[PDB]
Amino acid sequence: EVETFAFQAEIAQLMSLIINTFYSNKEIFLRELISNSSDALDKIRYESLTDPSKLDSGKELHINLIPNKQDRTLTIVDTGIGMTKADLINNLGTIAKSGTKAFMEALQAGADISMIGQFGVGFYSAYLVAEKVTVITKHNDDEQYAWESSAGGSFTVRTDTGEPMGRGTKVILHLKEDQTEYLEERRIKEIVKKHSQFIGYPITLFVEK
């Protein structure tokens, strides 16, 4: 049972800008997703301070980076607070309408796309390198869901009956054919070292057979 939704016009416009603007510094997508994971982990850690049972769905707070060259996917997994179905539908838990407004004003004033996270809409930088993004998520207060979009103005949401996640979010980047450098160990290590040095959770880069 798959529900298809239209993005809000402003978010479709954000996505089209990210996909169509010439802009070479695409590697910042990984910084932005890791920052989103860190923010999600901070949230479940805060809730656990007064309610330890919030970690019954998983005590370890971490981020895994999983490249798969056969599937052409880079997966960012975190064990943070996760998203409810409403969060997914409401722009993956962001205030993306007002964030997009500010971001586009900043761009016209001289900012560049690398500054997207300052506007709270860093998730959509995934579309710098991905033709399709799939988000699997599980919040303590809801079932497990899959969100997906190849842009083009719509996204889908379904209940996910696949591999159970415990708690947190998994962003599966189906990379564009010319962006496979982001599956290479040395390239991922370089970007994490450059941009994510002060993320306060373990970031494990999986290796491939």
Ligand X SMILES: Cn1ccc2ccc(C(=O)O)cc21
Question: Tokens 């695409």 map to which residue?
Answer: 26
Supply φ then ψ for residue 33, to 5 degrees.
-70, -40
Closer to ligand X by CB, 126 or 165: give it: 165
Edge-to-edge order in the sheet of strand 154-159: 3-6, 154-159, 144-149, 130-138, 168-175, 73-78, 63-68, 203-205
Closer to ligand X by CB, 110 or 162: give it: 162
- The annotation status of 123 as a binding-site residue, yes or no, is yes
Residue nearest to ligand X (CB): 163
- Give the SS3 label for residue 119: helix
Cβ 185 to ligand X shortest distance, Å:
23
Contact region for ligand X (CB under 6 A) — 6-14, 38-46, 67-75, 155-163? Answer: 155-163
**177 class by beta-carbon count within 10 Å (0-12 exposed, 13-18 middle, 19+ buried):** exposed
First to last CA, the chain: 35
Q: Please report whether residue 163 would count as binding ligand X according to CB under 6 A.
A: yes
Q: Please report whether residue 200 would count as binding ligand X according to CB under 6 A.
A: no
Contact region for ligand X (CB under 6 A) — 137-145, 161-169, 181-189, 200-208? Answer: 161-169
Q: Please report whether residue 70 would count as binding ligand X according to CB under 6 A.
A: no
Q: Please report whether residue 53 would count as binding ligand X according to CB under 6 A.
A: no
Binding positions are: 36, 78, 97, 123
Binding site for ligand X (CB under 6 A): 161-163
